[PDB]
């Protein structure tokens with residue numbers, strides 16, 4: 309394999325002797341050159357582990373590097389300063405100061421200009437991280453909420469122009485807020501130019517997707533493929549009008565990109581560099597699990613998928629160090645953590661914690677949550693979880709059957725209960741969610757609905773408000789970067805129009821994708837309304853998290869509370885958090901608290917609590933005790 313020094317000499321071959329000498333002494337080249345030596349080895353090794361001796365590897369690689377240099381050379385000076393800061397501070401993602409928020413630009417603020425006018429609110433809330441849902445061109449009507457990309461560079465006209473996007477990003481950086489967007493690298497819409505030209509037989513896009521002449525191979529692949537949207541189609545393939553079949557893990561209008569073609573990696577790396585130079589701080593790598601296929605396997609979490617992501621990572625370390633990756637893997641817990649690494653995805657969603665927060669609200673027993681916090685929370689250095697309560701997606705019950713089995717819980721039976729409970733098909737349930745993708749051949753099913761709808765705020769359950777604070781308190785204090793689903797901080801309910809909208813009716817996820825609720829937001833400072841109670845109480849926790857060093861980092865050690873209804877953990881051996889998941893008062897005995905200081909200040913209620921006597925928590929009460 310070629311080395312960094314050799315490849316760099318060829319990068320400079322585009323310049324004449326005179327120009328070359330100039331580049332050689334330029335600061336930008338010195339930076340690029342240095343990073344090349346440090347990170348190229350990783351890029352080469354990863355690409356080689358996937359493509360091996362492919363004739364196109366070297367040519368593609370040199371093309372990619374020439375492009376990377378030009379990209380970095382063009383990269384704005386201010387962004388280069390962030391590159392340097394990020395290089396020296398890899399743990400910025402682990403700081404307790406970070407608090408994130410996510411929203412659809414159209415649903416939350418109409419368009420990009422309106423979104424820009426919302427930044428003051430974001431500052432008011434304390435956000436330092438803002439993730440914006442799919443903003444680029446996509447099919448009219450059905451685009452899976454923008455996840456069917458027809459272009460990675462042209463902004464959705466209803467949202468604005470690429471120029472408005474740069475302004476938003478600039479304004480966000482000005483307000484001390486990092487910009488986060490998706491990089492839907494596993495698939496494009498069937499309307500993307502690459503898809504059209506590939507299907508048309510254009511030789512320049514040959515093998516950019518997986519297209520078959522008939523069902524022979526698809527049938528074989530389907531023997532082991534998991535169905536993501538069984539409502540849409542069986543297996544992982546959709547048929548074209550001409551009779552051929554294309555790989556479509558998701559909607560039929562979302563075509564899976566063929567990373568087995570090195571030219572596909574190169575093309576996507578080019579798109580990534582474009583996003584990077586827009587000033588994006590973090591890219592949410594959509595469906596990282598599916599970027600590699602292999603007959604006879606589930607075609608999820610394969611070795612090459614990880615390798616390819618680690619390759620993309622090295623490209624950033626070389627051409628835009630400030631850009632981090634956020635893994636979005638909604639799979640088995642054993643697989644989820646594999647995407648998280650300083651050299652792969654520095655951060656990643658923590659679906660296990662999210663899914664278990666809801667499990668605990670339903671069962672009132674913290675067993676599974678405690679187990680997860682005890683054995684699957686701590687991560688390798690310079691990485692962090694993105695902890696959340698809800699998102700634009702349905703809730704999948706991705707806890708491990710193996711973990712459950714150890715607690716004497718049947719995974720399959722338990723999900724049946726959870727699914728019944730959260731869609732209000734279980735006696736006494738307080739949840740008002742809606743089913744999503746119930747698969748009759750597997751029994752699998754997911755849940756849609758906003759945080760407030762699932763906790764019972766729609767029917768004014770007196771415990772609804774406190775339930776929301778409890779869930780969010782855990783995502784805000786366990787360690788990691790918390791991501792608030794904007795709208796939750798004021799108890800926004802489900803959208804009551806989606807079910808009859810012909811473009812949304814077959815996707816219950818729109819139930820939990822409501823528009824900015826003027827009314828609720830106008831009540832955020834009124835302590836007598838649910839909106840104000842949720843907001844002020846959530847804002848208080850944010851204020852505490854960001855100013856109190858005891859919440860720094862992402863490591864935690866659980867504490868055995870000896871009360872099956874109360875979760876307990878300790879941060880930096882100085883902050884003891886208790887969360888009561890029962891709708892009834894629950895107690896932590898003095899006996900259990902004997903080793904703790906006799907007194908401790910509770911950051912939540914602001915009162916000093918005695919630990920040398922039975923500690924009783926009110927229904928869904930949360931305590932953040934400073935024991936050091």
Ligand SMILES: OC[C@H]1O[C@@](CO)(O[C@H]2O[C@H](CO)[C@@H](O)[C@H](O)[C@H]2O)[C@@H](O)[C@@H]1O
Nearest residue numbers: 452455536558594595636637638701702
């Ligand atoms: O139920 C959705 C299903 O898709 C996943 C795959 O990671 O979610 C991401 O990708 C989908 C297809 O591109 C998007 O529709 C979805 O919005 C996005 O978060 C998982 O959440 C799940 O397996």
